Ligand binder design. Structure first.
Ligand SMILES: Nc1ncnc2c1ncn2[C@@H]1O[C@H](COP(=O)(O)OP(=O)(O)OC[C@H]2O[C@@H](O)[C@H](O)[C@@H]2O)[C@@H](O)[C@H]1O
Ligand SMILES: Nc1ncnc2c1ncn2[C@@H]1O[C@H](COP(=O)(O)OP(=O)(O)OC[C@H]2O[C@@H](O)[C@H](O)[C@@H]2O)[C@@H](O)[C@H]1O
Lengths: 1348, 75
C-alpha cells in the first residue's frame, strides 16, 4: 500500500501561484487576493518576493509552477456512510497514461466495458417527475448490466445528485449483491468548501471529511456517493470549467488507447449524454464532439436540451443569430434579460459547430422511444455511430457482433444486427462463437445456432486447441491440467519442452478421469505425440515423438481435420468446466447420444468426488444425475420401438469414445438408476439363459439337468427348437450347456456335493492317514484355487500385477475365501499329525460353516432372495452388534440364576456347563424345573423381568428397526441387486461349461496352448460386440431420429407442467404495464471550423449572417495569426506584412509564384488579399505558402472493379469504381496523392516522387494528360482570410482490366521509398477519406456512372 | 429450426429462369449427378443472380437467352 504513497508524490504535480499580483477588483471579504488569493494575504503559498520582476498581470504560464502532490489518500464521510472512497489531486496538465496506470494498478480497477459520461445543470436544475423516473430506472439498468463506468462531475448539487441517489439506492436495494456500479467523479480542486482538512503532507490513508450545506459561498461541496474522486487544480480559486478539457482528454485515452486483443486495437464504446445545462454544458458538448465521442440529447427535458433538439434536423446554413436568441429567450425566461450580444453569438456558434457534425449527434426525441427503453436508445446510439464509420467490406456487421458479445444483452444483438440483410458466410461467427463459448455467456450459443452456425464443421483442431488453453482458472479441471504439464515437465519427461498445453495432455488427463479402458479420444503415438513441440524437432523424416503425416512444423501441427468426434469434443470441454446450461445445448447435436451421456455422467460423478469441499461437488453430482435421467429417457424411447435393435445398440462398441461399450461404461459410474430400467435387466436375463428361453420355469430345467435323456424329449423350450435347427442332438446339448444358467447350476451342485464329501470323511473316515476318499479333497482345493489365478490373468493391466490384487483385497468375500483356504491350511497340519486329532476334530468343524457363508454368497440370484439377502448385507455389522448385545443380556442373568440357589454339580470344564451352558438352554426350552425350582417368589419375579426386556423390548423392537429400515432403502436395495446382477453374469459367461471335476483339464488347456503360442491373443469372450460400417450407420441414424423424438416429449413436458405455466402468465402481464402508458446557403463551412491543425490557436466567431464581406460585422477582430513556419524558406515571408516588404504581384504571376486566382479577382485591403468566399475568422497567412490562392494539383486515378470471372461488378443502380489512395505514417487517414504546384510538371511528382517512380514516373507524367473535372477555390480548414487553397482536378481512367495502360502503372511502381502504405481501394460513400477529398470523389463520380 | 425437428416440413418450390444463374457452370453434368455441390457467392453478381438456400425444390426454365428477365412467369 505504501507503494502508492511513495509513487504519487514522484509523478503527479500541482499548481500554485508564486508571485503577488494584486487584483484591482477586491473579492467579497477576500480583498487580500493577488488575482487568485488561495490561502494568504496574496496569491502565494511561500514568500511573496519581488523575484527581481514585479510583473503586473502575471501570466499563468510564467507565474504558476508545479510542486509534487501530497494531497492523495482516502476519505470517509463522517456519519453519512461507512465505506471508503479514493481521491487524488491532479495537476491541470497531466498525461492520461499516468492517471490510467494509477487507477488500474494502484486502485485495483479493471478495464471497463462502457464509458457513459453524464453532465447537466448543477446549481439551477428543475425536473419533471417523468424526467426523474428515467434517471431512476434506465441509467441504473444500463450501469448494472454492462458494468459501465459512470463518470461525471463531483459536487453536491443537481443532476449528479440524482445520479448519486440512483446509484446508492440500487446498491442498498441489491441487498449486498456481488459487484457495485463504480462511479468516478471529476471536479476542479479550486472550488472545494473544506479542502483545508484534506491536505496532508504524509500519506493520509485515514481521513475524515464532513460536509456542510450552510457555508456554501462561491464554493460547493462534494458528493457522498461517488466511489472515486479526481481533483484537478489550476492555481485559480473561483474558476469554473477547469475540469472539462482534462475530462474530455482522459475519456478519449481511456476509450481508444487500451484494449488491443488479437489485432491492432479495440475501441471501447463511449457515450456522452445531457439532460439540462447552461454555459458549461455547451462547452463540454463542443469539446467532446471534436474527439469523436457521440452525444445523445433528450428532448422535452430542459432549456439547453430543448434548444439543441429544436435545431436537430435544421440545415446548418439556416441558423440565424436572431432565431437563436429568439429560441434562447423563451426557454431561458428566468434569466433571458441577462444575455448580452457576445454571449448570444458565442452560444450560437457553439450550437453551429455542434450541429455541423450530424454523425456524432442523436436525439431522444421526447419519445415513444421510452416505452421501448432508454437502455436501447443509449445503446444503439453507439451502434449507429458504428454503422456510420466502417471500412472496406462487411466489417460493420462483425464489429457490432464483437461489441454485442461484451454487452451481455441478447435482445440488442437480435433487434438490429440480425434483422437487416445479414451476409451469411458463416465463417464470420467462428471468432465470435469462440468468444461466446469462452465467456459463458451460454445464451448467445443458441442465438448463433438459429443463424446456421453448424457445429459439425465449426469445431476444428486448432479451434479446440485454443479453447482448451482458456479454461476457467478456478475450475478443478484446469488445476488438473496445470499439473500434468508439470508432472511431465519440459526437461525430464517431454524432453524438448512442454510449457504449452496440447491435446495429448488433455487426452492423458481424460484417461485418468476415465477408467482402465483403451486409448482416449486423441492420438498418443508418434504420429501425433503432442507433448514436445516448442524446440526445433525434425519434420516428416523424424516420425518419432514429433510430426509424421501433418503438413508443416510451424509451432503447431496442421489441420487434423475433425478427429471423427467434433460434437463430443465440445461436449467434454463444456462438461469439465461445469457449464450446465451450455452442455445441454451441445448434447442435443450429438451423434452417439447414449454413450456420450453415460460418459458425461461418469466424468461428472468422479470429478465431483475429487475436491472443492462444497456447493459444486453437490452441483456436479446433481448434473450427473440429470444426465443420467437424460440418457435413461433416450434409451427408453429407443427401447419402446423394436427392442431387438435396442439391445444390439446397448452392447455395441463406440469408436468415437475409446470404445467403452455402453453396458461396460455404465458400471464404473455405478449408475444406480440406468442399470435398473427395464430393457437393461431384460438384456441381462437375455445373456443369462443364453440360448434356451426366458419363459421356462426354474423347477423344470433342473429335472432335465440330471436326466440326460430328458433333454431330448419335448419338455424344455430352446431357441434352436422353434427354428427346428436340431440336426445334431449333441449340438443342441452343447447349446444347452454353454448357457450360463446351467454352468451355474452344475457349479452349485458340485459345491453342494463337495460339502457332503467333506462330511463323509469326518463321521466314518476319521483316520490319521490319507485314505481312498482323501486325495479328492486335495485335488478339489487345487482346482478351485486355480480359478482365482485364471481371473488374475483374465483382464489385468499389462504392467500392474500388485495393483490388480488390490481390488481382490477390496472384496471382503474374497478375503473370506482366502481365509477359508488359510483355515484349511491350519487344519490340515493338525489332520496329518497323529497326536492332534482331537484339536483337528474341533478346528475343522467351523470350516464347514465358513464355507457355508461362501455358499450363501453365491445365492445372490433369486428374485425374492437377492433383494432380500441384500437386506442382511445391511445387517452384517449389526449382526455382530446384536450378537454382542444379546450375549451380554443372556450372561447378565446367567450369572444371577445360579447365585441364590445352591448348585453343587461341578467338574473339570463341566462346572462351567452347569454354571453358564445351562443358562442359554433355559431360554429356548431346556429349563430344568426340578433343579431350577423358599426363594420361589423371587424366582418368579426375576424370570418375568428378563423376558419382559427380551421378548418384549428386544424381540418386537427389532421388528420396528427391521421393517422401517427395510422400507427406507428398499428402492436402493432393489436397484443395488439390479446393479450387482451383472457381476454374477460377468464371471460365469466367460467360462467353459466343464464340471469343476473337469475344469482340471481346462486349467491345463491354456497352458499347453502357451507351449505353442507365445502372446496372449487367444480369444475375447466378452460382450464387446463389434459392428460394421453398413450397420453402424443404419443404427446411429435410427437413434438420432429417436433422440429428437424424445426431445419432443421433455420439451412438451416442461410446458405442460403447471408450475411452468405460471411463468407464462407472469411475464405476459409484465407486457401489459408497458403497453398502456402511450397516452441552405452554401458557405466555406470547413474553413470556419475551429482547432486549426498544427497550430494551437483559435479563430474569431464569424456567423452565417456575417460570413460575406458585404455584410458588416462590427465585432470582427480576428487575431493576426501566423504559423511558426510563416518566416521561413522560399515561401512568401509576408506573414508579417505590416512592413512595406509586401510588394509581390497580386492577381498576377509573380515569377515562379503564380499568385493569381483561377476563379476571379480578389479584393486587396491594407495591402493584403481578402477571401472571396467570405470571412474565416483568422487573419494572417497561417501554414500556407503565400497570400491569396496557393495553387496545387490533385491528380486522381480511377478504374473499374471486376469479379472473379472478370466481368464488371454490379450495383442496384450505378456501377462499381476503384481508386488508388495513400496513407502516410503520421496522418492516420486516407488521402489522394496530390502535391503542391510549386514545380511546373513535377507537381504529381512532388506528391509521388517516392511513391510512383523515379524515371518511369516521368513517362507516367507524359501519360498523365487526362481530363479535368473541377477547378477553383477549395474549402479547407487551413484557410485564413488571406491565404486560401485553389486546385485543378485532373482525372485519368483505366477502362480495360487487362494488360494495357494499367500494365505500365504496375511495373513502374516504386512505392516503398518513404511512404507507409499504398493500395487500390473501392469507391464508396462511406469510404474513409478526407472530407475535402470526398467532395472531389463525389463530384467526379458522375463522369463515369459510379454509385453513391 | 424452432419446431425442434417436428414431423413434416413446409415444402417450398422455387421457379427461376435458367439463363440468369451465377455459377450454373458447375451444375451441368452429362451423367446423373445425384451428388453435387453448389457454392453461393454474393460478390460476383453482375446481371446474374444467386439462388436461395432455403427452397426445398427448384425448377430452372431455359429459353436460349442469357440476361432475359421474365422467361419464367408464363410457365
Ligand atoms: N463545479 C460546479 N459545481 C456546482 N455549481 C457549479 C459549478 N460550476 C458552475 N456552477 C454553477 O452552476 C450554475 C449554472 O448552472 P447551469 O447553467 O445549469 O450549468 P453550467 O454552468 O453550464 O455548468 C454545467 C456543469 O456540468 C458539469 O458536468 C460541468 O463540469 C459544468 O460545471 C451557476 O450558478 C454556476 O456558478
Ligand atoms: N482537407 C483536409 N482534411 C483533413 N486534414 C487536412 C486537410 N488539408 C490539410 N489537412 C491536414 O492539415 C495538416 C497540415 O497539412 P500538411 O501536413 O502540410 O499536409 P500534406 O502535405 O498533405 O501532408 C504532410 C504530412 O506530413 C506528415 O509528417 C504529416 O503527418 C502530414 O500528414 C495535416 O494534418 C493534414 O493532414
Amino acid at each position: 500500500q505504501e507503494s502508492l504513497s511513495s509513487w504519487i508524490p514522484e509523478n503527479i504535480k500541482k499548481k500554485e501561484c508564486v508571485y503577488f499580483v494584486e487584483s484591482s477588483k477586491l473579492s467579497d471579504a477576500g480583498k487580500v487576493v493577488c488575482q487568485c488569493g488561495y490561502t494568504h494575504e496574496q496569491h502565494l503559498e511561500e514568500a511573496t518576493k519581488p523575484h527581481t520582476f514585479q510583473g503586473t498581470q502575471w501570466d499563468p504560464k510564467k507565474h504558476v509552477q508545479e510542486m509534487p502532490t501530497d494531497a492523495f489518500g482516502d476519505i470517509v464521510f463522517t456519519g453519512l456512510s461507512q465505506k471508503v472512497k479514493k481521491y487524488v489531486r491532479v495537476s491541470q496538465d497531466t498525461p492520461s497514461s499516468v492517471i490510467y496506470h494509477l487507477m488500474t494498478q494502484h486502485w485495483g480497477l479493471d478495464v471497463p466495458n462502457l464509458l457513459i459520461s453524464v453532465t447537466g445543470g448543477a446549481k439551477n436544475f428543475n425536473m419533471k417527475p417523468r424526467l426523474k423516473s428515467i434517471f431512476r430506472r434506465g441509467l441504473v439498468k444500463v450501469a448494472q448490466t454492462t458494468g459501465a463506468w459512470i463518470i461525471t462531475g463531483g459536487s453536491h448539487t443537481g443532476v449528479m445528485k440524482q445520479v448519486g441517489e440512483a446509484v446508492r439506492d440500487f446498491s442498498l436495494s441489491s441487498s449486498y449483491k456481488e459487484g457495485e456500479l463504480i462511479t468516478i467523479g471529476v471536479a476542479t480542486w479550486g472550488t472545494v468548501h473544506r479542502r483545508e482538512g484534506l491536505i496532508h503532507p504524509t500519506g493520509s490513508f485515514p481521513a475524515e471529511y464532513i460536509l456542510d450545506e450552510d457555508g456554501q459561498g462561491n464554493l460547493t461541496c462534494l458528493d457522498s456517493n461517488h466511489s472515486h474522486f479526481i481533483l484537478v487544480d489550476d492555481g485559480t480559486h473561483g474558476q469554473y470549467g477547469v475540469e472539462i478539457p482534462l475530462r474530455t482528454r482522459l475519456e478519449k485515452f481511456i476509450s481508444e488507447q487500451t484494449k488491443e486483443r488479437g489485432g491492432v486495437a479495440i475501441k471501447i464504446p463511449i457515450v456522452c449524454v445531457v439532460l439540462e445545462g447552461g454555459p458549461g454544458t455547451l462547452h463540454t458538448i463542443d469539446n467532446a464532439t471534436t474527439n469523436g465521442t457521440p452525444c445523445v440529447v433528450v428532448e422535452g427535458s430542459g432549456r439547453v436540451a430543448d434548444v439543441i433538439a429544436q435545431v436537430a434536423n435544421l440545415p446548418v446554413s439556416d441558423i440565424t443569430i436572431s432565431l437563436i436568441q429568439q429560441k434562447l429567450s423563451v426557454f431561458f425566461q428566468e434569466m433571458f434579460e441577462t444575455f448580452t450580444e457576445s454571449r448570444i453569438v458565442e452560444w450560437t456558434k457553439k450550437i453551429q459547430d455542434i450541429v455541423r457534425r450530424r454523425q456524432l449527434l442523436t436525439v431522444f426525441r421526447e419519445g415513444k422511444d421510452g416505452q421501448q427503453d432508454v437502455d436501447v436508445a443509449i445503446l444503439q446510439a453507439l451502434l449507429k455511430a458504428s454503422r456510420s464509420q466502417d471500412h472496406f467490406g462487411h466489417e460493420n456487421w462483425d464489429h457490432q457482433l464483437k461489441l454485442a458479445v461484451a454487452w451481455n444483452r441478447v435482445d440488442i444483438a437480435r433487434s438490429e444486427i440480425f434483422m437487416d440483410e445479414w451476409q451469411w458466410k458463416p465463417s464470420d461467427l467462428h471468432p465470435t462463437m469462440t468468444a461466446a463459448l469462452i465467456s459463458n455467456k451460454p445464451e448467445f450459443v443458441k442465438l448463433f445456432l438459429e443463424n446456421g452456425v453448424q457445429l459439425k464443421e465449426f469445431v476444428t483442431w486448432d479451434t479446440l486447441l485454443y479453447l482448451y488453453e482458456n479454461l476457467d482458472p478456478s475450475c478443478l479441471f484446469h488445476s488438473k491440467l496445470q499439473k500434468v504439464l508439470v508432472e511431465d515437465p519440459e526437461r525430464p519427461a517431454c524432453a524438448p519442452a512442454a510449457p504449452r498445453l496440447q491435446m495429448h495432455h488433455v487426452a492423458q488427463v481424460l484417461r485418468e478421469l476415465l477408467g482402465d479402458f483403451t486409448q482416449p479420444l486423441y492420438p498418443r503415438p508418434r504420429h501425433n505425440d503432442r507433448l514436445r513441440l516448442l524446440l526445433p524437432v525434425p519434420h516428416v523424416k523424424l516420425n518419432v515423438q514429433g510430426v509424421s503425416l501433418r503438413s508443416l512444423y510451424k509451432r503447431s501441427s496442421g489441420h487434423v481435420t475433425f478427429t471423427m468426434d467434433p460434437i463430443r469434443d465440445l461436449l467434454i470441454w463444456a462438461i469439465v468446466q461445469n457449464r450446465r446450461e451450455l452442455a445441454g445445448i451441445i448434447w442435443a447435436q450429438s451423434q452417439d447420444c447414449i454413450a456420450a451421456a453415460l460418459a458425461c455422467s461418469k466424468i461428472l460423478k468422479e470429478l465431483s468426488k475429487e475436491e472443492e469441499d462444497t456447493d459444486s461437488s453437490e452441483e456436479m453430482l446433481a448434473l450427473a444425475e440429470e444426465y443420467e435421467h437424460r440418457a435413461i429417457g433416450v434409451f427408453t424411447e429407443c427401447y419402446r420401438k423394436d427392442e431387438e435393435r435396442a439391445q444390439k445398440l446397448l452392447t455395441r462398441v463406440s469408436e468415437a469414445w475409446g470404445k467403452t461399450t455402453c453396458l461396460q461404461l455404465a458400471l464404473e459410474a455405478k449408475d444406480m438408476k440406468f442399470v435398473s430400467h427395464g430393457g437393461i435387466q431384460a438384456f441381462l436375463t437375455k445373456v443369462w439363459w443364453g440360448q434356451l428361453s426366458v419363459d421356462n420355469g426354474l423347477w423344470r430345467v433342473t429335472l432335465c439337468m440330471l436326466a440326460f435323456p430328458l433333454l431330448l424329449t419335448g419338455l424344455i423350450s430352446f431357441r434352436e427348437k422353434r427354428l427346428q435347427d436340431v440336426g445334431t442332438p449333441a449340438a443342441r446339448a452343447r447349446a444347452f450347456f454353454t448357457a450360463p444358467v446351467v454352468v451355474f447350476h452344475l457349479n452349485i451342485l458340485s459345491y453342494f456335493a463337495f460339502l457332503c464329501l467333506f462330511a463323509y470323511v469326518l463321521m466314518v473316515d476319521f483316520q490319521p492317514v490319507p485314505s481312498w476318499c482323501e486325495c479328492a479333497i486335495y485335488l478339489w482345493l487345487f482346482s478351485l484355487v486355480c480359478e482365482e489365478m485364471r481371473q488374475l490373468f483374465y483382464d489385468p493391466d499389462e504392467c500392474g500385477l500388485m495393483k490388480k490384487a488390490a481390488l481382490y483385497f477390496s472384496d471382503f468375500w474374497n478375503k473370506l475365501d482366502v481365509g477359508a483356504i488359510l483355515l484349511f491350511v491350519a487344519g490340515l497340519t493338525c489332520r496329518l499329525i497323529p497326536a492332534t486329532l482331537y484339536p483337528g476334530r474341533v478346528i475343522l468343524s467351523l470350516d464347514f460353516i465358513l464355507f457355508c457363508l461362501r455358499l450363501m454368497h453365491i445365492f445372490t440370484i433369486s428374485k425374492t432372495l437377492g433383494p432380500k439377502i441384500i437386506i442382511v448385507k445391511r445387517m452384517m455389522k449389526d449382526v455382530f452388534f446384536f450378537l454382542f448385545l444379546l450375549a451380554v443380556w443372556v450372561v447378565s442373568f446367567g450369572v444371577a440364576k445360579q447365585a441364590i440357589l445352591i448348585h453343587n454339580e461341578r467338574r473339570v470344564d463341566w462346572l462351567f456347563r452347569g454354571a453358564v451352558y445351562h443358562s442359554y438352554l433355559t431360554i429356548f426350552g431346556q429349563i430344568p424345573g426340578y433343579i431350577d425350582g423358599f426363594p420361589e417368589w423371587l424366582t418368579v419375579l426375576l424370570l418375568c423381568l428378563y423376558l419382559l426386556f427380551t421378548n418384549i423390548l428386544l424381540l418386537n423392537l427389532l421388528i420396528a428397526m427391521f421393517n422401517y429400515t427395510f422400507q427406507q432403502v428398499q428402492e436402493h436395495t432393489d436397484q443395488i441387486w439390479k446393479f450387482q446382477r451383472h457381476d454374477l453374469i460377468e464371471e460365469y459367461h466367460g467360462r467353459p461349461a466343464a464340471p469343476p471335476p473337469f475344469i482340471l483339464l481346462s486349467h491345463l488347456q491354456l497352458f499347453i496352448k502357451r507351449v505353442v503360442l507365445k502372446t496372449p491373443a487367444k480369444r475375447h469372450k466378452q460382450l464387446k460386440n463389434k459392428l460394421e460400417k453398413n450397420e453402424e450407420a443404419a443404427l446411429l441414424s435410427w437413434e438420432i431420429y429417436l433422440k429428437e423424438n424424445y426431445l419432443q416429449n421433455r420439451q412438451f413436458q416442461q410446458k405442460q407442467r403447471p408450475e411452468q405455466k405460471i411463468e407464462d402468465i407472469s411475464n405476459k402481464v409484465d407486457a401489459m404495464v408497458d403497453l398502456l402508458d402511450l397516452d441552405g446557403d452554401s458557405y466555406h463551412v470547413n474553413a470556419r471550423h475551429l482547432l486549426y491543425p498544427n497550430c494551437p490557436v483559435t479563430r474569431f466567431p464569424v456567423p452565417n449572417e456575417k460570413v460575406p464581406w458585404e455584410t458588416e460585422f462590427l465585432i470582427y477582430d480576428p487575431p493576426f495569426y501566423t504559423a511558426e513556419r510563416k518566416d521561413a524558406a522560399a515561401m512568401d515571408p509576408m506573414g508579417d506584412t505590416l512592413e512595406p516588404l509586401s510588394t509581390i504581384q497580386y492577381n498576377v504571376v509573380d515569377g515562379l509564384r503564380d499568385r493569381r486566382s483561377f476563379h476571379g479577382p480578389y479584393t486587396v485591403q491594407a495591402g493584403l488579399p481578402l477571401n472571396p468566399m467570405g470571412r474565416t475568422g483568422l487573419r494572417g497567412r497561417g501554414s500556407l505558402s503565400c497570400f491569396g490562392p496557393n495553387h496545387t494539383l490533385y491528380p486522381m486515378v480511377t478504374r473499374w472493379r471486376r469479379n472473379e470471372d472478370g466481368a464488371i461488378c454490379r450495383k442496384s443502380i450505378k456501377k462499381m469504381l476503384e481508386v488508388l489512395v495513400v496513407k502516410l505514417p503520421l496522418s492516420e487517414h486516407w488521402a489522394l496523392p496530390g502535391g503542391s504546384r510549386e514545380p511546373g510538371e513535377m507537381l504529381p511528382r512532388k506528391l509521388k516522387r517516392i511513391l510512383r517512380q523515379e524515371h518511369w514516373p516521368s513517362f507516367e507524367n507524359l501519360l498523365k494528360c487526362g481530363m479535368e473535372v473541377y477547378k477553383g477555390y477549395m474549402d479547407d480548414p487551413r484557410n485564413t482570410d488571406n491565404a486560401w487553397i485553389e486546385t485543378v482536378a485532373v482525372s485519368v481512367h483505366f477502362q480495360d482490366q487487362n494488360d494495357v495502360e494499367l500494365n505500365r502503372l504496375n511495373s513502374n511502381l516504386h512505392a516503398c521509398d518513404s511512404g507507409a502504405s499504398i493500395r487500390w481501394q473501392v469507391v464508396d460513400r462511406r469510404i474513409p477519406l478526407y472530407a475535402n477529398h470526398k467532395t472531389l470523389l463525389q463530384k467526379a463520380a458522375a463522369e463515369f456512372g459510379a454509385h453513391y
